[PDB]
Ligand binder design. Structure first.
Ligand SMILES: *[C@@H]1O[C@H](CO)[C@@H](O[C@@H]2O[C@H](CO)[C@@H](O[C@@H]3O[C@H](CO[C@H]4O[C@H](CO[C@H]5O[C@H](CO)[C@@H](O)[C@H](O)[C@@H]5O)[C@@H](O)[C@H](O[C@H]5O[C@H](CO)[C@@H](O)[C@H](O)[C@@H]5O)[C@@H]4O)[C@@H](O)[C@H](O[C@H]4O[C@H](CO)[C@@H](O)[C@H](O)[C@@H]4O)[C@@H]3O)[C@H](O)[C@H]2NC(C)=O)[C@H](O)[C@H]1NC(C)=O
Ligand SMILES: *[C@@H]1O[C@H](CO)[C@@H](O[C@@H]2O[C@H](CO)[C@@H](O[C@@H]3O[C@H](CO)[C@@H](O)[C@H](O)[C@@H]3O)[C@H](O)[C@H]2NC(C)=O)[C@H](O)[C@H]1NC(C)=O
Ligand SMILES: *[C@@H]1O[C@H](CO)[C@@H](O[C@@H]2O[C@H](CO)[C@@H](O)[C@H](O)[C@H]2NC(C)=O)[C@H](O)[C@H]1NC(C)=O
Lengths: 73, 192, 193, 50, 206, 195, 205, 146
């Protein structure tokens, strides 16, 4: 599958390495949530990534299902 | 409006001092830098030095020991004084007004330039001889004269630049009698 | 040429930081205030001083600094030294050491449409009276009092910042993902009024 | 003075006068009324010298 | 300092042609390169600076572009008055100038009117070629069957203001007395309109 | 030093320290940052503060501060007061109770290419979590988060000079041994703004 | 003092204090560094820190600050506030409290030949590695490292200040009847050394 | 805003902070002084030093800073930096080891009548004759001389 990743600058869609298929988006707030909103992390994993108590994690297998909140799928 | 007139001795003896003068009009030396360029005979131009608006100077590091630059803001004149002249110093010398942004300067306007040449040869009138035949045409050849210019006339005319033979000029002409005049008269004619 | 230089000259060639951004003298400047606590350095009970590092988020409208990005090549923000713009002069009234002001004069951000944002960091040694009655099992009600040192309520008026979700943040904000609790004190509540 | 030396500035003790006669003030001046004496130290002498 | 190389050394073009001139340094010039135009015997005039900024009063016909190590000057529609020598120069690491590229008017080719003239009794021998085009040409001479001669020199005319053709002349150390060094001699020249050399010769008599 | 005086006069005659030193506002200023650790002054386990004497080498190119060396007698470098030039506003994000930014404005080495090198001294009182369970046989991983306070990555970009702090000038501590060190660049993005 | 005012106005016409007084573009400014110890305030073994009150003794030449005394009413020397002349940025490199500069910028003395002499006071807290082994019978070896913070060895050349005889008296000068004697520490050896570089800068220790 | 800028320019164009703000030098500047006590920070019995946080309100009329409100759109009061105006140099006479004078130069409030109100904050470490006989039931009569 192809998922968006924040490893590259700017965010780009990259095919998952072999062994991983699920797209995910993890977002959590930090000190700059006053104006900048929640942090955004994009990548691909073999299983729905773990979630911290304050971090919301979303997992989906469809194509282009993990865009940036300000960009359409 | 903005114009610069280069001036000075066209002929200078070797080891003498060149004393060129640049005359400025249309702007104030106190607000524009003036720089000296020379283009040697058969060479690309090179930078010699700059007269700053603040009245300081800077020189080409290869000529630092030889050049002097000075100005008279009252006269709108900039002077270039150079010693130890040699045959390599023959060429056209330009003064230029500069332009700048921040600390970066470039040449913006040029003077007409003064042709400066140096040699030990004294002035002499040309000897002449006709071009003997090997549309009909005839020609005259001349040699042994210094300096240029020289005038040639006949009775489609073509003339050739003054060429140095051994540090002394030579000339040829084509178009019957040629009439020649030199500033420092003559006749030559074609025959069977 | 850098368009930021044109924008800076357009904004600040005719500007007076000594006067409020009001068209009529009776207008109040609305200030959006937010305080973010980075770490609680210590509470000293012997001196009754609470030491904290905070970031003060201050936003206001300055009509004189108004510009449009379309007229300046798409510049959406300009960074300006805070000494050049008018500032509401927010200070910690209940400091103990006499340091009323912030610790670093960060640049202000001037957004298109005349919105100004300032976010200086500060170290504050505020007074906090200690309830010793149940030591060591006590809790302490320390407080931070912010006010404008110069302007009265009819010149400068405070309001709480609004979160991106549209809710007023009437509390001290904390980076829960990066904050670390103090080795002696834990924080339970932090309301703002 | 570190910025000026004895060639540049001449230091001297303040002169006062009493009964039209001047005298140098060769001592530290202390208020006999408003000087709160220290809790642990009594000033026994207080000369001044150039 | 940055060495500046400029090419093509000679460009022949007709009125209304688009033309481009190229300038290349030995090092990065950071767009700090300028162009000026000089006509024969008159003050040069600056055309362009900072590789893009057109000088005031210069027509927009002139345009400049380039970056890094290579730069170009381009003329949209060559006017008759624009025939001149063009120089690029850089001004961030010393001042260094190109060799200059001469811009010449295009024309049909013309064969050289080659002729030879033995030294008259008043004398030196001379060889000439007239009204050839283009100016690029080669010439050679021999005496008593031996090529070249001592003191060989050449002198070529400027471009004809009307015909745009060119002419050349050449001479050697052969005085009226020195003419006895050979019984006969010949000279020849080649050009675009004459692949075989046009030649002329003199015998023991003129 | 007439040439250098003239150069300094002509560089700053109309210099602006407010706008970024770019040729075009869409370009990004690239700053090379290198931490040098001179001395570990103190570690406070109670307040969780580590005091370090450091140098922040900062390098960037200023477009407006170029000059031609031949115009000024061959002067290829000058030292100038750093208060005059534009500077990146590096702030110690995890400062405990020290100075957030640089306060010792030492001179800047400026080169004819416009390359600026600045190495101001600083004392960083960084705040870090102290793990005491193994005391006195404990080890502590303490850190110094450096970043431009008001400039973002689309406007000013910072890059580490080397993957490790320069320890070549490090005074040997009598209380702690630095087993390893490294510097990582991080680039977070927030949900308001992908740009 | 009108003639002094006129001379002072002449000297600073076009003077730039941020520019070092190299005449040629390659010249180096030789600076002699001396140290006068006024009081050894304390030595702290817990903080590995030595506190000293000293007077520096910096001497160099600035060709821009030279004049003919016969043309200026016989004025053979001039006293000028240090902020208005070029000063070498000599700082204590091994300071422990983060304070590099001197405690008080006093006026420099300028001789008519352009020789500048500067003797600013300083309070310094240099770090000093404590030889703990034989405490409290130990002796300590504490160094004060002075060098230009910015200028390279190719721009400013440091030298140990000579003695009054012009001999290489590479020592901390102590005014034997003025030094405030420390009650716990006895000064035994007080040398100085110019340290050559292995961006290269010299140090006077 | 333009009105206030014009006013501030007109006032200080030829103002002098050295001379006293009176029409005639034979007049006396009437300064009204009011001490506000914010916190008793410390009592140092061994050194006899009392540390307090105070506001030293000062009020006086500056004869030269009058303006007509109708000339400037009804602007009746403005805030200006205290460093620009003449100020009374009040000093804590019995300072032990603190600042003698005000060092936090906050802005003054200037009214169209020329009335100036300045309330700078200060920390006063006044020397006090501590009496320890009845310790710890003692009463201390500590004072500040301004
Ligand atoms: C003491 O404590 C400190 C902190 O207090 C702690 O420091 C951490 O140390 C660990 C390792 O010891 C660090 O982990 C590594 O971090 C590396 C940095 O990654 C960041 O930067 C990357 C930027 O470079 C790329 O990206 C940019 C643009 O993106 C591009 O221009 C560059 O050219 C370049 O390509 C970036 O990629 C990376 O993003 C990842 O993570 C974010 C989450 O923040 C996520 O959103 C992205 O999708 C992406 O996953 C991140 O921003 C990192 O490179 C390195 O990678 C290793 O592991 C990965 C597997 O995850 C492998 O693929 C790779 O080959 C490497 O093996 C690794 O993750 C950590 O960042 C430090 N954190 C801090 C805060 O300092 C010390 O370790 C502690 N000490 C001890 C002894 O434990
Ligand atoms: C922590 O401290 C703050 C301030 O010291 C406390 O808030 C204050 O609580 C008092 C309680 O007496 C309030 O006073 C009274 O409030 C009521 C409600 O309006 C009013 O009718 C009374 O006349 C009187 O003013 C005071 O307003 C309030 N102040 C603020 C700013 O909220 C707070 O309660 C303390 N925390 C806890 C957990 O007790
Ligand atoms: C601030 O400036 C902007 C930009 O000029 C103003 O918005 C409009 O901009 C257009 C430019 O195309 C003008 O024609 C309009 O007259 C402007 N006004 C309105 C009301 O649309 C804006 O009004 C200015 N003021 C504020 C308070 O933002």
């Amino acid at each position: 599958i192809v998922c968006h990743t924040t490893a590259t600058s700017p965010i780009s869609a990259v095919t998952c390495p072999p062994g991983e298929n699920l797209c995910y988006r993890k977002m959590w707030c930090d000190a700059f949530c006053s104006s900048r909103g929640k942090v955004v992390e994009l990548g691909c994993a073999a299983t729905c990534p773990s979630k911290k108590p304050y971090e919301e994690v979303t997992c989906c297998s469809t194509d282009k299902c993990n865009p940036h909140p300000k960009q359409r799928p | 409006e903005v114009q610069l007139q280069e001036s000075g001795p066209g002929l200078v003896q070797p080891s003498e001092t060149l004393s060129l003068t640049c005359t400025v009009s249309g702007f104030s030396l106190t607000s524009y830098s003036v720089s000296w360029l020379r283009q040697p005979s058969g060479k690309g131009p090179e930078w010699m030095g700059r007269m700053w608006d603040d009245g300081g100077t800077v020189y080409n590091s290869g000529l630092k020991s030889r050049l002097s630059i000075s100005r008279d803001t009252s006269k709108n004149q900039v002077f270039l004084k150079m010693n130890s002249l040699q045959t390599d110093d023959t060429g056209t010398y330009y003064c230029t007004r500069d332009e700048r942004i921040r600390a970066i300067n470039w040449f913006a306007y040029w003077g007409q330039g003064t042709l400066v040449t140096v040699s030990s040869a004294e002035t002499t009138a040309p000897s002449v001889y006709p071009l003997a035949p090997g549309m009909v045409t005839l020609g005259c050849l001349v040699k042994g004269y210094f300096p240029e210019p020289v005038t040639v006339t006949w009775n489609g005319v073509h003339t050739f630049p003054a060429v140095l033979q051994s540090g002394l000029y030579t000339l040829t002409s084509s178009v019957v009698t040629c009439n020649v005049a030199h500033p420092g008269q003559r006749w030559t004619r074609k025959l069977c | 040429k850098n368009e930021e230089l044109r924008l800076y000259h357009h904004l600040f060639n005719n500007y007076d930081p000594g006067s409020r951004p009001v068209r009529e003298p009776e207008d109040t400047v609305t200030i959006s205030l937010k305080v973010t606590l980075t770490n609680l350095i210590s509470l000293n009970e012997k001196e009754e001083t609470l030491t904290t590092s905070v970031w003060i988020g201050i936003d206001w409208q300055d009509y004189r600094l108004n510009y449009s990005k379309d007229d300046f090549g798409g510049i959406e923000t300009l960074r300006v030294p805070s000494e050049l713009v008018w500032l509401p002069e927010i200070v910690l009234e209940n400091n103990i050491d006499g340091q009323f002001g912030v610790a670093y004069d960060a640049n202000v951000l001037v957004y298109e449409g005349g919105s100004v944002t300032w976010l200086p960091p500060a170290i504050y040694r505020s007074v906090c009276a200690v309830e010793v009655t149940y030591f060591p099992f006590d809790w302490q009600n320390c407080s931070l009092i912010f006010r404008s040192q110069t302007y009265n309520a009819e010149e400068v008026e405070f309001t709480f910042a609004v979160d991106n979700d549209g809710k007023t943040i009437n509390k001290i904000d904390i980076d829960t993902e990066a904050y670390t609790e103090n080795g002696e004190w834990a924080i339970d509540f932090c309301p703002g009024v | 003075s570190l910025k000026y030396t004895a060639k540049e500035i001449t230091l001297s003790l303040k002169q006062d006068a009493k009964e039209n006669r001047t005298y140098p003030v060769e001592w530290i001046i202390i208020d006999p009324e408003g000087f709160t004496e220290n809790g642990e130290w009594e000033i026994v002498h207080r000369p001044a010298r150039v | 300092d940055i060495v500046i190389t400029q090419s093509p050394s000679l460009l022949s073009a007709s009125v209304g042609d688009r033309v481009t001139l190229t300038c290349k340094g030995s090092q990065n010039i950071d767009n700090y390169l300028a162009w000026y135009q000089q006509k024969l015997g008159e003050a040069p005039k600056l055309l362009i600076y900072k590789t893009n900024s057109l000088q005031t009063g210069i027509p927009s016909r002139f345009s400049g572009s380039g970056s890094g190590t290579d730069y170009t000057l381009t003329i949209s529609s060559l006017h008759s008055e624009d025939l001149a020598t063009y120089y690029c120069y850089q001004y961030i690491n010393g001042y260094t100038f190109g060799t200059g590229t001469k811009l010449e008017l295009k024309r049909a080719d013309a064969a050289p009117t080659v002729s030879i003239f033995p030294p008259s009794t008043e004398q030196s021998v001379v060889c000439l070629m007239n009204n050839f085009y283009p100016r690029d040409i080669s010439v050679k001479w021999k005496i008593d069957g031996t090529e070249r001669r001592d003191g060989v020199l050449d002198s070529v005319t400027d471009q004809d203001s009307k015909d745009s053709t060119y002419s050349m002349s050449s001479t050697l150390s052969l005085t009226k007395a020195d003419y006895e060094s050979h019984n006969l001699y010949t000279c020849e020249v080649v050009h675009k309109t004459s692949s075989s050399p046009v030649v002329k010769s003199f015998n023991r008599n003129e | 030093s007439e040439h250098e005086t003239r150069l300094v006069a002509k560089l700053f005659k109309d210099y602006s320290s407010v706008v970024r030193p770019v040729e075009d506002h869409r370009q990004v200023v690239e700053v090379t940052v290198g931490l040098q650790l001179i001395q570990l002054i103190n570690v406070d386990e109670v307040n969780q503060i580590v005091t370090t004497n450091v140098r922040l080498k900062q390098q960037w190119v200023d477009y407006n501060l170029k000059w031609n060396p031949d115009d000024y007698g061959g002067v290829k470098k000058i030292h100038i007061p750093s208060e005059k030039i534009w500077r990146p506003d590096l702030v110690l994000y995890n400062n405990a109770d020290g100075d957030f930014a640089i306060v010792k404005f030492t001179k800047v080495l400026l080169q004819y290419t416009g390359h600026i090198t600045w190495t101001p001294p600083a004392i960083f009182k960084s705040y870090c979590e102290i793990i005491v369970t193994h005391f006195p046989f404990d080890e502590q991983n303490c850190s110094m988060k450096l970043g431009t306070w008001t400039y973002d990555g689309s406007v000013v970009a910072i890059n580490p000079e080397s993957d490790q702090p320069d320890l070549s000038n490090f005074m040997e501590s009598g209380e702690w041994v630095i087993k390893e060190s490294r510097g990582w660049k991080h680039s977070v993005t927030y949900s308001c703004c992908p740009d | 003092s009108e003639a002094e005012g006129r001379l002072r106005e002449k000297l600073f016409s076009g003077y730039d204090s941020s520019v070092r007084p190299a005449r040629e573009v390659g010249d180096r400014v030789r600076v002699s560094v001396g140290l006068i110890l006024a009081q050894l305030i304390s030595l702290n073994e817990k903080d590995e820190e030595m506190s000293t009150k000293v007077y520096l003794d910096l001497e160099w030449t600035d060709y821009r600050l030279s004049w003919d005394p016969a043309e200026h009413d016989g004025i053979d020397s001039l006293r000028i506030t240090a902020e208005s002349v070029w000063l070498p940025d000599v700082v204590l490199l091994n300071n422990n409290d983060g304070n590099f500069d001197v405690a008080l910028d006093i006026s420099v003395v300028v001789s008519s030949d352009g020789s500048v002499r500067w003797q600013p006071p300083g309070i310094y807290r240099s770090s000093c590695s404590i030889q703990v082994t034989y405490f409290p019978f130990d002796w300590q070896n504490c160094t004060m490292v002075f060098s230009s913070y910015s200028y390279d060895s190719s721009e400013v050349s440091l030298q140990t200040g000579l003695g009054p005889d012009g001999q290489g008296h590479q020592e901390i000068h102590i005014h034997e009847g003025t030094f405030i004697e420390n009650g716990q520490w006895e000064i035994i050896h007080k040398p100085s050394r110019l340290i050559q570089p292995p961006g290269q800068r010299q140090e006077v220790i």
